[PDB]
Amino acid sequence: SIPGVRKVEDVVIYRNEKFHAAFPSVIKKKNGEIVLAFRRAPDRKVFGEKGTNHVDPNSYLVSVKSKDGKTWTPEPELIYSHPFGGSQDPCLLQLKDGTILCASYGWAFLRPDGMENLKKPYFLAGGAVFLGGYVLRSTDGGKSWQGPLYPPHIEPEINYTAMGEKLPAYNRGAMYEGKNGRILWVVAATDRQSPNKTSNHLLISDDKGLTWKYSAPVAVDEKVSFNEASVYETPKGDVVAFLRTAGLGDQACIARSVDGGKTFTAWEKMGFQGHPMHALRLPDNRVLLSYGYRHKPLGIRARILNAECTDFATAPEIVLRTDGGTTDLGYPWAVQLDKNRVLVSYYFNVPGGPQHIAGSILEIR
Amino acid sequence: IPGVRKVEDVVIYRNEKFHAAFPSVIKKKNGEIVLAFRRAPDRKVFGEKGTNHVDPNSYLVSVKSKDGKTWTPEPELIYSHPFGGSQDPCLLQLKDGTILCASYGWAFLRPDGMENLKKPYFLAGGAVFLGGYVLRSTDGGKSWQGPLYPPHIEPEINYTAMGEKLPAYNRGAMYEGKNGRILWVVAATDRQSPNKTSNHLLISDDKGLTWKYSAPVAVDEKVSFNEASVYETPKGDVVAFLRTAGLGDQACIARSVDGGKTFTAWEKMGFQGHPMHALRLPDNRVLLSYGYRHKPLGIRARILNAECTDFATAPEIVLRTDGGTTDLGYPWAVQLDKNRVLVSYYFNVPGGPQHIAGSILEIR
């Protein structure tokens, strides 16, 4: 038992058997409204198909809302439908001034004459051609969204988009607004084609997400891939990135910068399995690190780190869910409900059930 | 024609990255002109050779105007269907301000889904037909509720890509009858091979929440009737203006003298053109606009008397002749002022993209 931690209850946030609902992020606005964004796409069983993967031309970015973390609006509102294909993993950032950024990335679906004419290299998965990143922005509390704004293509990235552009950077993971108002974003880039390898790189925005500048490599290895990453700034000003890996037995890793993101020291294993990671600063400046656990028993876990995020090896693991059906679940994202309660949202499935948004409400005193 | 003059042509929305087509347009009581259209990628953005009329990412979008000449440059989204691409947005504004936006859709299935489809289904361009759905706005087009799925009607043989009996649909204008009934002439596939469609009248007495089958409108052993605009005359005749297949692009008409309970035999109107749109002008004359997918390619119209009986003798107004390919047309008109009408349509010139355009007519 973990001092000061208790699960209040689990909740279902959005569930509809006709839909694959996945990859949530969530913010709470100054007016009290909790806004949770997620990817919604057809559950392909509605077309008589055998199963659903993570590409679909009609995957849209949608949201549901709550005043308390427990009662949710039943009909999702549309954040964004990309004119050129399906959209992924909406990642919300709310700035102190109320601006909301919603990062995403896309997949295009081409016909045979298009496939033949693609500039190489490109990335093909599930019959779809990768489009890379795009970001929507709202200055009215999410009532309307402007954009898309395309992140820069960064030098390590080798791919072209399905439309022949150099691939805009992208990721799944939390951005972080630094104390000086600069926005930190750790993005992924494909830096080798065969075998596929990705590395992480820090982008920085000094204009509240209108444009991004490359700052420094975050995690690079000759064999191990680094992809989904959440970034965090500690009270003393360290920049920390929590990293999903490929080729390292699902080991969750960390990389740190002590010079404001100009250089990162060597990446380290944190000592546990899980992905992807999300970090939330709690009211006492400790850090809730939540992650998916795609091993038996399938579910969602977390641990609470000290303020500087140095004690990940000794912080006890909080087990939130063990009842998952298949590995198609996870991607938790936490939000502070009030001084003593946190909602850890995630997407989930139980045996025989659809991919839906769910959450665990925690009491952290 | 006498007293009619083309004031000028306008570009309503054009972007080389997009195929923009199939417009419909209303003007709200506060004067704002709202034009809805289908927007899909021009497939050349993907290095493909051409663009057809199915795409999973075709969305219903709108641009707005106060005068019909200058238009908002960035389309707002009306609807993206969660299950596929959407077609031909057809707007009806009720006298009380409610707006209906009819549409229909295409789904894109994987091979194992294709193998398991319930037959008959309708396949075109690699996509499987979803049939109709209708969006509804009670706040002037700020938000849209739905979709509401029209009934499947007995003549229709197809199942949707999701295995349901196919909901009715069409491209064409609905019409609000003088008693508040909504008239809608829909299409149904009533023979699989060779394909044939027929038209049928649906009526709604609850402002578009539900629909009742009323009567067959146009059926033939061989000729198809598909896209149809419906219209109620001041005397109360119900008139439907019909696009055909199997009849040399002859524009046709069918009429009911009993409020839509029975239609008399369909007739040729004596000219080629499709699809048709009818607009009651301020003097109760009727502006019938249509695309002309023959040389010279473009947009044409005729002004009928109030009861729409003089189509054989009403002179043809030629609005455009500079079309590039046959992928153009589908005009829809809206009254700007007492003697100015905007005829919107989509269009292309040789080497140019599919874009929304219009011609402003002065009719005295």
In B149-223, DSSP assigns E strands to 175-176, 182-191, 196-204, 212-218
Chain B residue with minimal CA distance to A45?
A: B113
Going by C-alpha positions, the residue among A55, A182, A69, A164 that lies closest to residue A106 is A55
Going by C-alpha positions, the residue among A33, A39, A47, A2 that lies closest to residue A20 is A39
- Cα distances (angstroms) measured from residue B238 to each of B90, B176, B179, B241, B333: 19, 11, 13, 10, 19
Mapping DSSP to helix (H, G, I), strand (E, B) and coil, where does residue B114 land? helix
A243 with A255: CB under 8 angstroms?
yes
- Sheet containing strand B182-191, strands side by side: B175-176, B182-191, B196-204, B212-218
How far does B143 lie from chain A, in Å, by closest CA? 10
| A50 in reach of chain B (CB within 8 A) | yes
How far does B18 lie from chain A, in Å, by closest CA? 9
- Torsion region of A255: left, alpha or beta (phi above 0 gives left; psi -120 to 50 gives alpha): beta
B133 with B144: CB under 8 angstroms?
no
A238 with A260: CB under 8 angstroms?
no
Closest Cβ opposite residue A47 in set B43, B77, B162: B162
DSSP for A38-63, please give it.
Answer: EEEEE-GGGGT-S---S--TT-EEEE
User: Could you tell me which residues are beta bridge partners of residue B187?
Assistant: B169, B199
Going by C-alpha positions, the residue among A21, A27, A15 that lies closest to residue A142 is A27
**Cα separation, A112 vs A128, whole angstroms:** 12
Angle at A355 between CA A65 and CA B145, to 5 degrees: 45
Q: Which of A17, A52, A58, A150 to mutate to test the interface with B (most CBs of B within 10 A)?
A: A58
Going by C-alpha positions, the residue among A85, A72, A101, A93 that lies closest to residue A14 is A72
| B13 in reach of chain A (CB within 8 A) | no
**Cα separation, A325 vs A336, whole angstroms:** 28
**Cα separation, A264 vs A243, whole angstroms:** 13
How far does A167 lie from chain B, in Å, by closest CA? 14
B127 with B54: CB under 8 angstroms?
yes
A300 with A246: CB under 8 angstroms?
no
- Give the determination technique: X-ray
| B73 in reach of chain A (CB within 8 A) | no
Closest Cβ opposite residue A163 in set B45, B84, B113: B45
* Contacts (Cβ under 8 Å, ≥6 apart) of A49: B109, B110, B112, B113, B116
| A114 in reach of chain B (CB within 8 A) | yes
Whether residues B18 and A83 touch (CB distance < 8 A) is answered with yes
**Cα separation, B243 vs B220, whole angstroms:** 13
Residues of A in contact with B56 (CB under 8 A): 57-58, 109
φ/ψ (deg, to 5) at B205: -105, 5
Q: What is the CATH number of the domain that holds B321?
A: 2.120.10.10
DSSP for B237-265, please give it.
Answer: -EEEEEEEESSTTEEEEEEESSTTS----
Tokens of B339: 């003697």
Mapping DSSP to helix (H, G, I), strand (E, B) and coil, where does residue B22 land? strand
Whether residues A48 and B163 touch (CB distance < 8 A) is answered with yes
How far does A329 lie from chain B, in Å, by closest CA? 21
Whether residues A78 and B81 touch (CB distance < 8 A) is answered with no
* Contacts (Cβ under 8 Å, ≥6 apart) of B87: B22, B38, B53, B58, B103, B104, B105, B106, B171
Q: Using CA atoms in the order B82, B87, B88, B92, what is the torsion angle rounded to 10 degrees?
A: -20
Interface of B with A in 148-187 (CB under 8 A): 161-163
Tokens of B204: 């709604």
**Cα separation, A60 vs A78, whole angstroms:** 7
Whether residues B59 and A46 touch (CB distance < 8 A) is answered with no
Chain A residue with minimal CA distance to B111?
A: A49
**CB half-sphere exposure, A290, CA atoms < 13 A:** 30
Whether residues A82 and B46 touch (CB distance < 8 A) is answered with no
Q: Which of A47, A109, A161 to mutate to test the interface with B (most CBs of B within 10 A)?
A: A47
Tokens of B37: 């259209």
Number of structural domains found in chain A: 1
How far does A64 lie from chain B, in Å, by closest CA? 16
Interface of B with A in 336-355 (CB under 8 A): none
Tokens of A228: 């989904």
| B47 in reach of chain A (CB within 8 A) | yes
A109 with A85: CB under 8 angstroms?
yes
Instruction: Tell the burial category of A194 from Cβ atoms under 10 Å away from its Cβ (0-12, 13-18, 19+).
Output: exposed
φ/ψ (deg, to 5) at B113: -70, -40
Amino acid occupying residue B261: K
**Cα separation, A327 vs A311, whole angstroms:** 28
**Deposited resolution, Å:** 1.9
Which range of residues forms the domain containing residue B256? 1-364
Chain B residue with minimal CA distance to A118?
A: B47
